[PDB]
């Protein structure tokens, strides 16, 4: 429409694809090196120059980037263009109170829309389909990324965003979307609300669900597909690389997300040593962007554990199950949360010692985050019961506001959280299984 | 950058503008009549036909449309193209539990981006400026309309959306926007938060504030301009017509929103008789779209009371103060709320009689919505205090969810709300 068709590159030969990748990879390395002081330093210190890349395998010579490099160059230090050529910024959780920040040229936004349209098409969406977009609109990459891709595909986009459960179901009923884009966790909430409204979940217009932003199981898939009468497809990404639409599953094979590696070049490494592993081996997923202008990323470590699998329905490889992470990051209802994020907010309250413990659990199918924090000892003496309840509320509101997750808060006497014999607490107890 | 400069039509002659309007009006009326059964019907019933329009003055022959017509044709009954050619819907409060729903073709989106870019440019914005967009992103037209306009103009858009007050100020501090787009009420919240963070409001990077979605005073303008060190400009619109970017003020003259009447054709009428009034005269603003494909609107009554003023900085006319409305609609923090909307949610709870009263008040500079409802008599006798407090919280949450506004809720005994001698209550007491 024109976007009903596959792009030529989607069905290109392995040779054609690898030639394109090599030509873009040379450009992207040199773009990074010339235009981003950090990469100039980081390459120089590693003894490597862009010229050193003669073949795809030569990528292993180049250093890794991580979340720390963004943190150390906040807010815009990793831009490879002047800010006056940057039309979009997006923001998500960092390890400190400064968000992780990414920027995009006009071309970058166009590229993003194109791969996100490609993803929705791979999953079976078409021009003219009504599409219910329940990913968060705003600083998160999910909502706006899915928005542009769907609009580029010629879908009728319902910009629902991520809350208002009764209204979600009202509009699914009234607007009759064929496609829903939503976290897998919130999809379950929506099914529950259909039931409470007297709507059998299989009596909906939906034929396709495209789920991402967090891991989900085969069992969740079977449960959604069966109850709602849809094909459910897996859409992957992360803000640093672009957003959603880094990889997406094809409905013809349903055999895991296809990585759009004409744009986003994947490697798998041992998470401990950093050595590159052969395709089929489980390790940590690393990306190098091939077409990004504003913020090229070079061997960016996702911390996601997975594996690369051979091409099937496309010219490109696939991801295996994403089985966890190699850092301490939590995802709650699609929202990235670091324990250190919470710590910073906890310590900011002068009545609290800084001692804290997050317990994650499952209440039915819903994740629950519960936060215990300790008073300073001098404070137990003087803080009233009403004062410590308000302290709990205030802490809950700041975490909701600054991190973006809802949490139960409990305020304990000093020593109230079980510690090592010298006072060290386990920061995260995840019982969600 | 292809959006730094004015468009030719912006400084065209009045003759040339009116000739474009007439041609586009002929097209719009016929597009509506040919393709929307509703309009076929209302035109026919009014004894008029698109051919009947031979000059701009002939528009007064055509019937008005209103929110009711959207209500009666929900969700998509006023589309003039197949739904498969519509790429966007947006939704805002109706008088019922069904939202007011509007649709756009790909071309429509492009047209809307163009007039919103033009608006932000009029207010002094330029390609390369960092713009902090704090209008709500989602079903509201505000967030996404401003988004596409600012992107089109080549601003660095920060897609902040409407909440998270501490984070708003953190990112204004850190990202150093030159432009903020936000409701005028929420701008005041933001200034308070600056103070609480130990930031003097005048030590921001901001140079331009573009405020709308609701009426604001000269006094609010003076306060914001003084305290923040900016020029504040007024941007107007409504979802049925397109969104924000129907009209916007020029920083050159700061004499009220310029109507982009190459796209949106204004009339002022007496809100009682429907008679068209001469420019300079106070009445009700009525729009007819000139370029819209998916949902052409013909003589749509905004219910906004204002006047048309002569051109100054552009070829196009300006709006006077928007002084109020000719219906019972409320706006709280940019969110449209109908009393009938609230009634529908109240009546849905089977313990409650349906008797209700909204009190609006000003808590400092902040609007409060406070809602009293009555139990049915048989229920007072039997509902505990815990249950009745839970009822209040549930009503509060359903109003927040379905209407989009926060409110205090009180649950009273039957007759607890002052009524007429035969039990009619005043629905709205606006003390703001
Ligand atoms: N399909 C998925 N399966 C498993 N994990 C996922 C999946 N999608 C994203 N994640 C996790 O979340 C991260 C990035 O979170 P971030 O907030 O940066 O970006 C958005 O989650 C972008 C997104 C939005 C909508 C759909 C898909 C992707 C990644 O490193 C994974 O750990
Ligand atoms: N600048 C303003 N001055 C006074 N009232 C305004 C102004 N802007 C809009 N209103 C009121 O809000 C309605 C429409 O509400 P609705 O939600 O459909 O559309 C968005 O308020 C669109 C908007 C978004 C952001 C900025 C400006 C305009 C309109 O009929 C007026 O009563
Ligand atoms: K995520
Ligand atoms: K409004
Ligand atoms: Mg179904
Ligand atoms: Mg200033």
Secondary structure string (H, E, C) spanning chain A = CCCCCCCHHHHCCHHHHHHHHHHHHHHHHHHHHHHCHHHHHHHHHHCCCHHHCCCHHHHHHCCCECHHHHHCCCCCCCCCCCHHHCCEEEEECCCCCCCEEEEECHHHHHHHHHHHHHHHHHCCCCCCCEEEECCCCCCCHHHHHHHHHHHHCCCEEECCCCCCHHHHHHHHHHHCCCEEEECHHHHHHHHHHHHHCCCCHHHCCCCEEEEECCCCCHHHHHHHHHHHCCEEEEEEEECCCCEEEEEEECCCCCCCEEECCCCEEEEEECCCCCCECCCCCCEEEEEEECCCCCCCCCCEEEEEEECEECCCCCCCCEECCCCEECCCCEEECCEEECHHHHHHHHHHCCCEEEEEEEEEEEECCEEEEEEEEEECHHHHCCCCHHHHHHHHHHHHHHHHHHCCCCCEEEEECCCCCCCCCCCCCCCEEECCC
Judge residue B45's burial from the number of C-beta atoms within 10 Å of its C-beta, 0-12 exposed, 13-18 middle, 19 or more buried: exposed
If one looks up domain A328-433 in CATH, what number appears? 3.30.300.30
Residue B328 DSSP class: S
Domain range list for chain A: 1-327, 328-433
Homologous superfamily of B328-432: ANL, C-terminal domain (3.30.300.30)
Q: Whose CA is nearest to atom 14 of ligand 1?
A: A238
For B287, the 3-state DSSP assignment is strand
* Spatial CA neighbour of A146 closest among A125, A176, A163: A125
Task: Flag if A89 and B158 touch (Cβ within 8 Å).
Answer: yes
| Angstrom distance (rounded) from CA A41 to CA B303 | 62
Q: How distant is the alpha carbon of residue B363 from its chain centre?
A: 23
Judge residue B200's burial from the number of C-beta atoms within 10 Å of its C-beta, 0-12 exposed, 13-18 middle, 19 or more buried: exposed
**Quick check: CB of B239 below 6 Å from ligand 2?**
yes
**Quick check: CB of B79 below 6 Å from ligand 2?**
no
Q: How many CA atoms lie within 13 A of A190 on its CB side?
A: 30
User: What torsion do the CA atoms of B139, B145, B147, B151 make, to the nearest 10 degrees?
Assistant: 150
Look at the alpha carbons of A230, A231, A232, A237 in this order and tell me if their dihedral is positive or negative: negative
CA distance B175 to chain A (A): 7
| Angstrom distance (rounded) from CA B78 to CA B253 | 38
| Angstrom distance (rounded) from CA B186 to CA B204 | 17
* Spatial CA neighbour of A308 closest among A266, A339, A272: A266
Contact A7, A314 (CB under 8 A): no
Which one of B143, B236, B332 would you pick to mutate in the ligand 2 pocket, going by the greatest count of ligand atoms within 8 A of its CB?
B236
Residue B276 DSSP class: B
| Angstrom distance (rounded) from CA B423 to CA B24 | 52
Non-local (6+) Cβ contacts of B431 within 8 A are B359, B360, B361, B362
Q: How many CA atoms lie within 13 A of A196 on its CB side?
A: 11
Angle subtended by helix axes A218-228 and A184-196, to nearest 10 = 30
**Quick check: CB of B409 below 6 Å from ligand 2?**
no
| Angstrom distance (rounded) from CA B289 to CA A45 | 61
**Quick check: CB of B322 below 6 Å from ligand 2?**
yes
Residue B305 DSSP class: E
For A398-414, letters b (16+ CB in 10 Å) and e give: bbeebbbbebebbbbeb
Residue of B85, B128, B401 with shortest CB distance to A166 = B401
For B233-249, letters b (16+ CB in 10 Å) and e give: bbbbbbbbbbbbbbbbb
Residue of B83, B86, B157 with shortest CB distance to A88 = B157
Q: How distant is the alpha carbon of residue B232 from its chain centre?
A: 18
Q: How many CA atoms lie within 13 A of B7 on its CB side?
A: 16
Residue of A74, A75, A167 with shortest CB distance to B402 = A167
Non-local (6+) Cβ contacts of B95 within 8 A are B67, B68, B71, B338, B340, B341
Task: Flag if B174 and A398 touch (Cβ within 8 Å).
Answer: no
Task: Flag if A159 and B86 touch (Cβ within 8 Å).
Answer: no
Which one of A181, A236, A241, A247 would you pick to mutate in the ligand 1 pocket, going by the greatest count of ligand atoms within 8 A of its CB?
A236
Ligand 2 atom nearest residue B302's Cα:
30
Q: How distant is the alpha carbon of residue A25 from its chain centre?
A: 24
The helix (H) or strand (E) run that includes residue B51 is none
For B139, the 3-state DSSP assignment is coil
| Angstrom distance (rounded) from CA B180 to CA B154 | 15
Q: How many CA atoms lie within 13 A of B400 on its CB side?
A: 13
| Angstrom distance (rounded) from CA A389 to CA A363 | 23
- Residue pairs spanning A and B at CB distance below 8 A: 111
Cβ count near A423 (within 10 Å): 11
Residue B252 DSSP class: T
The residues with which A288 forms a beta bridge, in sequence order, are A265
Helices (H), B157-310: 165-175, 184-196, 218-228
**Quick check: CB of B305 below 6 Å from ligand 2?**
no
Domains A1-327 and A328-433 belong to one CATH topology? no
Cβ-based contacts of B138 with chain A (< 8 Å): 137, 159-161
For B330-369, letters b (16+ CB in 10 Å) and e give: bbbbbbbbbbebbbbbbeebebbbebbbbbbeeeeeebbb
Residue A22, CA distances (Å) to A13, A108, A146, A247, B115 in order: 14, 20, 28, 19, 42
Angle subtended by helix axes A141-152 and A106-122, to nearest 10 = 70
The values of phi and psi at residue A241, to 5°, are -90, -45
User: B317-321: long-range contacts at Cβ-Cβ below 8 A with a sequence spacing of 24 or more?
Assistant: B317/B258, B317/B259, B317/B261, B317/B266, B317/B279, B318/B247, B318/B255, B318/B256, B318/B257, B318/B258, B318/B259, B319/B236, B319/B247, B319/B256, B319/B257, B319/B259, B319/B285, B320/B256, B320/B282, B321/B256
Strand order in the sheet with B264-269: B264-269, B283-289, B300-306, B324-325
| Angstrom distance (rounded) from CA A241 to CA B354 | 53
If one looks up domain A1-327 in CATH, what number appears? 3.40.50.12780
């Amino acid at each position: 429409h024109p976007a009903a068709a596959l792009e030529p590159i989607e069905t290109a030969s392995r040779d054609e694809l690898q030639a394109l990748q090599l030509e873009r990879l040379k450009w992207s390395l040199r773009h990074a090196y010339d235009n981003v002081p950090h990469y100039r330093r980081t390459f120089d210190a590693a003894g490597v120059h862009p010229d050193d890349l003669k073949s795809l395998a030569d990528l292993a010579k180049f250093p890794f980037s991580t979340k720390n490099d963004l943190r150390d160059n906040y807010p815009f230090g990793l831009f490879a263009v002047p800010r006056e050529q940057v039309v979009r910024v997006h923001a998500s959780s960092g390890t400190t109170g400064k968000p992780t920040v990414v920027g995009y040229t006009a071309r970058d936004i166009d590229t993003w829309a194109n791969v996100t349209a490609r993803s929705i098409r791979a999953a079976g969406g078409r021009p003219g389909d009504t599409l219910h977009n329940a990913f968060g609109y705003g600083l998160f990459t999910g909502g706006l990324g899915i928005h542009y891709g769907a609009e580029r595909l010629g879908c009728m986009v319902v910009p629902m965003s991520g809350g208002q459960t009764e209204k979600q179901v009202q509009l699914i009923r009234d607007f009759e979307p064929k496609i829903i884009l939503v976290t897998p966790s919130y999809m379950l909430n929506l099914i529950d609300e259909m039931v409470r409204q007297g709507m059998d979940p299989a009596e909906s217009s939906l034929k396709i669900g495209i789920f991402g932003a967090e891991p989900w199981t085969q069992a969740l898939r079977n449960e959604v597909e069966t109850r709602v009468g849809i094909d459910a497809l897996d859409i992957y990404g992360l803000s640093e690389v672009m957003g959603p639409g880094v990889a997406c599953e094809c409905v013809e094979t349903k055999d895991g997300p296809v990585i759009w590696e004409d744009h986003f070049y994947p490697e798998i490494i041992d998470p401990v040593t950093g050595e590159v592993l052969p395709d089929g081996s489980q390790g940590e997923l690393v990306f190098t962007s091939l077409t990004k202008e504003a913020m090229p990323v070079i061997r960016y470590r996702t911390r996601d554990l997975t594996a690369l699998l051979p091409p099937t329905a496309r010219a490109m490889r696939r991801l295996a199950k994403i089985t966890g992470r190699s850092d301490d990051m939590l995802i709650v209802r699609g929202v990235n949360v670091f324990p250190s994020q919470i710590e910073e907010i906890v310590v900011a309250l002068p009545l609290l010692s800084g001692q804290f413990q997050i317990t994650l659990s499952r209440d039915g199918h819903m994740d629950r985050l519960d936060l215990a924090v300790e008073l300073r000892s001098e404070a137990a003496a003087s803080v009233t019961d009403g004062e410590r309840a308000a302290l709990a509320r205030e802490l809950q509101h700041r975490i909701k506001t600054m991190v973006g997750v809802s949490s139960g808060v409990t305020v304990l006497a000093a020593g109230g959280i079980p510690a090592t014999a010298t006072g060290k607490a386990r920061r995260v107890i995840d019982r969600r299984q």
